[PDB]
Write a protein that binds this DNA or RNA. Structure first.
Lengths: 199, 63, 117, 143
RNA sequence: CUUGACUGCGAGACAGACACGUCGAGCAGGUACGAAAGUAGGUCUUAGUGAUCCGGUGGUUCUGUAUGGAAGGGCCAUCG
RNA sequence: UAGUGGCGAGCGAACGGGGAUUAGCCCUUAAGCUUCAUUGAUUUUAGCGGAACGCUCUGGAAAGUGCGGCCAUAGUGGGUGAUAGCCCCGUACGCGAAAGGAUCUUUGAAGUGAAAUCAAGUAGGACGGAGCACGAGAAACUUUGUCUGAACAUGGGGGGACCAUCCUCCAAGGCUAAAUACUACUGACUGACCGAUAGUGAACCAGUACCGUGAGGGAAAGGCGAAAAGAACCCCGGAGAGGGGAGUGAAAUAGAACCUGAAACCGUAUGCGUACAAGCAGUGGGAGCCUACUUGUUAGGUGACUGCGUACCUUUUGUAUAAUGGGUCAGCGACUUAUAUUCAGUGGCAAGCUUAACCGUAUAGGGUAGGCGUAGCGAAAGCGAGUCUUAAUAGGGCGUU
């Protein structure tokens, strides 16, 4: 099945890796993920909330002028906005199965498009960005998502400055960062963990 | 629960798998004028026909 | 996402005011009058792509009437005689031969008189 | 690619908007018609209201009571009795699986399929066909 | 002479926005008359009327807020 | 949902679960909380250090172009003459306090808690109210304005009128941390927030100016340039205002009312048409003239003459209507959002599906309490592939691969 840079195959399941690409479900999962990372921090004011505006501006007949009940009407330039926002949430529900099934079809496309790279273990020695650049340059590898089974502090301190590299664990991976980075490096333990999670 | 069913509609229309049951009018308090054949045929619990269903289960908050 | 609509309103008004240029006064320079003048010009232009085909036909018929009466024939007798014969020749090129090629039009009215209609 | 993915044809729709121009289909009224109640803001007709005659929910009588006896009642059909664990169908055992709610106390088993296994039903009533189909396929019954 | 101005219903129609309304063969249980076929679910026919919610009265197999009862409620018949 | 309700509009539980939180001490005197004095410790009120870039092209100016590097627990920060990890302030990362404050912790001390001693004008009741989801209703339970008024652990009150029997508690004395609410006020960080008619009323000396007798109402107003280098000097002019030069600047038609500089509206210049012609001012035809081209069966501009031709909106059976509405321009100005639900479409799982709070190194995973589905009938008890009605195994209603 899947190839490792350490000379052997790993014999993955045809369920987690190598299923059909449901484009609709993957698109629903990435819209759901980009929705759940939006904070709804805004508000405008309505005609009740803009300051003042109690009295009628003029009497209703006799003035020969159009008919107003407040200075702060939304037609007026002092006035409020008509359907003024309040802080809302954009977080939507993706099912647990729909999440897991959108994952199983982008690991499949990471396999088919030669975009997934399996290594036996990926471990840096020191917390140095230059060391991790050198370790990725052996693999011929820029703009990579490194998925390990658990993120080490050396591997986290390196590449948290590096411009196009991200280090995540298996639980902490998401559809957007799987589709985003130009290559996806996983360890053998990460492929074990993806078969445990996804099926 | 953020939709209030009309309580007078819930006492009048019990829902089954066959539709919404109701009882009949006219079997109250003037029962000598009526023949037995009229009092026999309002006695059961009828269904609710098509023209009434959308209005009743909009009242009973189900639309 | 507040979106400020003053940059598109301007281009849509420029389009209407460009279609209205050449017109009198506020018909060519204020939007609420130029807009109506452009719509009205469009209705008249639709109507007059039809009346062009009506007006040119009448001019052809009037010129053929005038050319046929110089040769001693009506328009209507000429059109009848050109179908006792078979000419399949239209009012446009007959009016053109009425003005320009008068001997050919005389040949055509003689072949209509030859069919004695 | 994030640049490349869209959903199925027919899964999202454009959300046509009322009141944006006369060549859109919903200008000048937005699908509301002309003068009257159901074109105003808050122009709602209240549910049940028939224009002023006696509506159906006030013209027909009220007909019964609800039993408080049956709020804790339950029914568990024979398709489900193989789903408990331990070769016993008890009230707490039917609550260990999610076959029946908490705060239920009375369960009848009726016949709606195949019992699968040979289970024991303690404290649980059963219908005639369901007791027949439980005792047929190895079951038993005590209390 | 007598109670069919019956009880349970009810195939099927008519009417009809709905609520209502109209006609009804037949089947069961019991009866009138008639020697017997049979007629009889009121009146030659179409007006003579009034929803629901409240209350009242008589039943009831139902419910009955720990339990046994009651209270109150439900259904059925009926009155204002 | 049960109830409750001119049983109308509506109002609305509890039992039982799932959790966040974690403690009970006393009236034979306690936990706890204060205030002091101490015991160590932690934070805060200021700071310190803090890596690594050169050459070249265009340019007013390089951060940009082309090439070659370096740093990284520091790479999408700010501004520096155009866009900078390496130019500056910073950032990750370590260090840091004479003196104050705050939280936690020892271990004494004085207080308090504390009302005295297990509860009498109290429980209960009668009237009149109020609350309990409960419109006094079969009306329990609570509270009390008036009037009354107990028992004493072989007591007493609750279990929704009431009564027996059981079950469960001990009222008429108290004190108690956390989970909970809120933010005028601080600090940091963030935004599919606004960007000068927006966002606060208020970016500017704004609750100002102004209006009111007052309470109170309540504005308008941002931008030169990278740097003032903000124009030495000359000329007209009133030692004016404003200009014409000259200088500065990359640019002054960036000259201070200063970025850009639209439309309404007002001009000057050129072309053509207009003083015998009747109306929504155009449109179809169309001569002439004038410019560019390079010439022709073109392009631009006027449009004599001529056929047809009573704006737009809104309302209406119907409007050119002498019905409404609009002076015009430029900005602004009207189907939103939340929560429940139904239908369609589209996906995931499938006799099952799905989680809510909440936990979570936190969009993952967990949590299946609950919701809907797998069975219906009956008002219900109940019975169940049937059930209800019925004297009926008859009929009929509803239901059943």
């Amino acid at each position: 099945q899947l190839n490792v840079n350490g000379a052997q195959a790993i014999e993955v399941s045809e369920r987690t890796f190598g299923g059909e690409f449901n484009e609709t479900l993957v698109h629903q999962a990435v819209v759901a993920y980009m929705a759940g990372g939006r904070q709804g921090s805004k508000a405008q004011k309505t005609r009740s909330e803009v300051s003042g505006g109690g009295k009628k501006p003029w009497r209703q007949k006799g003035t020969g002028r159009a008919r107003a009940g407040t200075i702060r009407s939304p037609i007026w330039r002092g006035g409020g906005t008509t359907f003024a926002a309040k802080p809302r949430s954009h977080e939507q529900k993706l099912n647990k199965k729909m999440y897991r099934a959108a994952l199983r079809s982008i690991l499949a496309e990471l396999v088919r498009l030669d975009r997934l790279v399996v290594v036996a273990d990926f471990a840096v020695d020191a917390p140095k960005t230059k060391g991790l650049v050198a370790k990725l340059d052996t693999l011929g590898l820029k703009d990579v998502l490194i998925v390990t089974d658990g993120v080490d502090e050396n591997l986290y301190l390196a590449a948290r400055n590096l411009a196009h590299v991200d280090v995540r664990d298996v639980q902490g991976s998401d559809p957007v960062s799987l589709i985003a980075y130009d290559k996806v490096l996983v360890t053998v333990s990460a492929v074990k963990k993806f078969e445990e999670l996804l099926g | 629960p953020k939709m209030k069913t009309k309580s007078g509609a819930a006492k009048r229309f019990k829902k089954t798998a066959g539709g919404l049951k109701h009882k009949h009018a006219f079997k109250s308090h003037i029962l000598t004028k009526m023949t037995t054949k009229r009092k026999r045929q309002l006695r059961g619990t009828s269904m609710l026909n098509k023209s009434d269903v959308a209005r009743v289960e909009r009242s009973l908050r189900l639309r | 996402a507040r979106v400020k609509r003053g940059v598109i309103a301007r281009r849509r008004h420029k389009k209407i005011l460009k279609l209205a240029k050449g017109y009198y006064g506020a018909r060519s320079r204020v939007f609420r009058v130029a807009k109506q003048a452009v719509i009205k010009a469009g209705q008249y232009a639709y109507r007059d792509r039809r009346q062009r085909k009506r007006q040119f036909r009448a001019l052809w018929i009037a010129r053929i009437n005038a050319g046929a009466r110089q040769n001693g024939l009506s328009y209507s007798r000429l059109i009848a005689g050109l179908k006792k014969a078979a000419i399949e020749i239209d009012r446009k090129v007959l009016a053109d031969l009425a003005v320009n090629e008068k001997a050919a039009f005389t040949a055509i009215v003689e072949k209509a008189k030859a069919s004695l209609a | 690619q994030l640049n490349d993915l869209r959903s199925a044809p027919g899964a999202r729709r454009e959300k046509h908007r009322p009141g944006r121009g006369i060549g859109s289909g919903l200008g000048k009224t937005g699908g509301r018609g002309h003068k009257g109640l159901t074109s105003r803001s808050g122009g709602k007709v209240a549910p049940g209201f028939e224009g002023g005659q006696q509506p159906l929910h006030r013209r027909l009588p009220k007909f019964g009571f609800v039993s408080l006896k049956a709020m804790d009642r339950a029914e568990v059909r024979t398709s489900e009795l193989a789903k408990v664990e331990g070769d016993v169908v008890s009230l707490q055992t039917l609550k260990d699986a999610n076959l029946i709610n908490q705060h239920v106390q009375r369960v009848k088993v009726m016949l709606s399929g195949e019992v699968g296994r040979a289970v024991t039903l303690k404290g649980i009533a059963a219908t005639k066909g369901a007791r027949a189909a439980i005792e047929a396929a190895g079951g038993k019954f005590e209390d």
